[PDB]
Amino acid sequence: TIILGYGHQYQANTEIEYLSNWIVWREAVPDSTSRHKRPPLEVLNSQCTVIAGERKTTVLPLRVLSDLTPECTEQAISLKDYKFILRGGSGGLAVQVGGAGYYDIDANLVAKENTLSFRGLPEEFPLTFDLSKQTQSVMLKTPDDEVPVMTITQKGINTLVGTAAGKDRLIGNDKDNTFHTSSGGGTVISGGGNNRYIIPRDLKTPLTLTLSSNSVSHEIFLPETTLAELKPVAFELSLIYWAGNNINVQPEDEAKLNHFAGNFRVHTRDGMTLEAVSRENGIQLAISLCDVQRWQAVYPEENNRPDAILDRLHDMGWSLTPEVRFQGGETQVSYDPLTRQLVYQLQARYSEFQLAGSRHHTTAVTGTPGSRYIIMKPVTTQILPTQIILAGDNDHPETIDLLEASPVLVEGKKDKNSVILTIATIQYSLQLTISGIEESLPETTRVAIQPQDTRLLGDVLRILPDNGNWVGIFRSGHTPTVNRLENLMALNQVMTFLPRVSGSAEQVLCLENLGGVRKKVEGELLSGKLKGAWKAEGEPTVPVNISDLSIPPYSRLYLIFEGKNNVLLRSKVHAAPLKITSAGEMQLSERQWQQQEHIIVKPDNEAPSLILSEFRRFTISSDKTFSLKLMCHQGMVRIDRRSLSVRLFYLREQPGIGSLRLTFRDFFTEVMDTTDREILEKELRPILIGDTHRFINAAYKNHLNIQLGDGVLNLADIVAEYARIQKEETAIMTTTVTTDSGELDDLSGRYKSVPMARKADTLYHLTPKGDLQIIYQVATKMVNQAMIVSLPNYRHEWEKYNLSILSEIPQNNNTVVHSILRVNGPTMQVRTIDYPIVSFSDTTFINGEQMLSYDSHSSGRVYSREEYMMWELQQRVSEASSARTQDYWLMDAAVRNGEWKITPELLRHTPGYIRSTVSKWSRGWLKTGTILQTPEDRNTDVYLTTIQNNVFSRQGGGYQVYYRIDGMAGADIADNAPGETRCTLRPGTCFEVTSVDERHYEWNIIYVTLKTCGWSRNGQSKTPNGDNLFN
């Protein structure tokens, strides 16, 4: 790196002045009045020269034109004649022009990259540079005249970089060129060769790309743009944006637009890679590649399986290249849209692959010798056939896992040197094909039907007849009928409600563990009685303690309850911790540490070296120090006695963000065993900050680094930063908010204003002690800063919270976007107001997750209040996890006092729900804005919980209409048994019909949303042509 200046050689013309008072002689400037005299300082040279060596050299002359300020402009104009002679080397030359002078750049042609950058100019400067012109002038538009502030003579440049945010006009050579365009629009005219473009987001003016006739290929990079921000426009190479100015790729001649088929690629930030493909009529932009790692990073809260990604892309209106590749991960996945076949290729031996079918594509897996293929439990119907191809090593045989599928009946078949096995559960089935790679079935393959029953593929083959193919291979014994099946993957804080039965007098609840880690169920019975735990077919039930239950891996447990009273059981599920007492390298595969929720390290003599394979840490900021400081501020670091505890979050293929706690027992010396006293801890803290290793146990001093996939986590850094945070407790800001804190439609409560301006993204954290930790990031770019809004004891007091959090999101166009965050139980409802333009969105904690990530630049469709608030009815009908968690939280709030009671406080937070059946529905009859009323019935019952209350499943015969009441304040509830939430709505109550949807008319499903009124004395009581509503 060379930084250059403007140095002139002066000639100081001087004279001798005789100071007669001190009779001395001194040097002095010539007198300007004594005839004619030379100037006191005369400039002789105005040239600088740099000759580069063999390495890459960057030249950065002083920036004399950095803004349009008059003094800066004058200084730049005065220096417009300075000569810069820069000769690049074979390594490469990068020049960033200061803003004035004659530039004579002589870059080597051998060098792969020779850069000419104009980013040092004023931010909004119209730059017109042509790479095909050897000599050029960069004119500065001064008042009343134009000044050639720069004159550039370049040779060998191929990496033109534009201004920051100016209206630039760039033209390339006939060679390969790279263009770093500005964020202010303009035009780019790339000549021949293969050209690359890096275009930022939020363009001030639409940008036009002109593909020349002699051009070969083009690659467009969008480092700040996701695929969801682009409109899939057909028969065009232009990149259209949902919001914001778009790129306008056009060719020199429209006749030869089809030339750039396969020679036009667009790279997008979330790992997408669009390609130009010839089609039936013209050209199109189809998705060709996908990096699953970048996509998972951009969308951590969604299902990142290739099938889920394909479904998401199809729902977005995006086409597919004839061969779609899914790069990243342990395997390369290929999709063929013509035959709808998804193929997996294994590369790493001894890799545990989870095989899950789909309702849209057929799956085939090509395995590696010595591998483990886990068959997942079938969850949907009409699953297309799946295939497994085995490499027969005979020294490292593979295995096929049916343990996690919970198979009830397995039937075998033989067809052309392959064994076809069906895997049918109680309610679902799946057909799996097993075939070899060399036209032979390896008899050494192991089929694990049951944990204690592991057979060999040869033994399975022998009992398989040729004629009369279908025979049984496995059949589970008789089990009691299951009224409710509850998976233990939902972690804790699960409220199970079993309504009483009429005469069966025996309700069976089944707790199933689909993983390989033992589960501890810390249940607690509120209503009903437990007869014991089912043991076998014909012996008395075994009594068990609901306080703690042990569930062995891949095993079930049928609890028996009486059918007279309602059954309400609150259960806490915690997996058994993993104890690591050995030393040396301790490597855990991805499935090994993803199965665990707590890992305890207790070294016998020396600590091991933990290596978590493929651990992708979840971070909201790219700064490691800031991320670790925020993690320390959020309470994931705990120090008690000599033990250090670390809580980590990782990105995973499944929806949500994973969590893993690491505890290092005896991590500190014996001086830290006095953590009870705060004065001693305060005395220890300065040393813990300065010299962390002084208080670290000698068994850990060589094992302070934890290998987390690609990154590394150092325990000493965490300890030092945690100590620093403890010091500052007794730039991240905290704002504790109480139910009765803050200033005074649905926004009818308190208001709290965020002090600063936030960014687009937000983070919601729910600590184990039920603390809400909304985290905002300050919009300032120079310094990373965060502001945390704290709601202590939120999970146990969410019904008393009705405040709104107001914030501001500045935009690139000097515009401000208003955001209101309303906390509604596990749901974080956010309204965006644009100046009118009002958008609604929400996120919900589900399945015990404690981290929620929402990014504004991740969607391309804006939903109004009616559209968003209508979506929740569709999710409730499908019984989405959000509705289940809302039901769980409401049931938990219903028992705050210890006895079941639906308080009037919960009425405001709880929308109403009605399910009704009509004899016949007329399409288009119900229009938005109409008025509906209940008939002259005694009371119409409104249900707050519709997931497991048996009040929302289809009943009777005909069309089904789903209702949702916005305002339930003022409705009298009924005496409810423990577990049921019923409200009796007053007769003759108006219902302002809003946003009627009938997309599932062919499925006999009608969707309706409503608003309450007063005593309007109008509407339809019995409704036309019978079909009395609100029974």
Describe the protein in words:
This protein is mainly β and 1031 residues long. The chain contains 11 helices and 78 strands. It has a 15-stranded mixed β-sheet. The chain has a 5-stranded parallel β-sheet with strand order 1-7-9-11-15, with no helix packed on it. Helix 6 packs across helix 8 (715-729).
What is this structure, in a nutshell?
With 1031 residues, this protein is mainly beta.
Strand percent estimate: 35-45%
Amino-to-carboxy terminus distance: 81 Å
- The biggest beta sheet, please? 15 strands, mixed
Number of helices: 11
Shape: globular
Give me the count of strands. 78
Helix content percent band: 10-25%
Strand neighbour order, sheet with most strands: 17-19-21-25-26-27-28-29-30-32-34-38-37-36-41
Structural class label: mainly beta
Radius of gyration: 36 Å
Organism: Escherichia coli O127:H6 (strain E2348/69 / EPEC)
Protein name: Efa1/LifA protein
PDB class: toxin
Keywords: bacterial virulence factor, glycosyltransferase, protease, toxin
Give structural attributes:
1031 residues, 11 helices, 38% strand, 1 chains, toxin, globular, five-stranded parallel sheet, Efa1/LifA protein
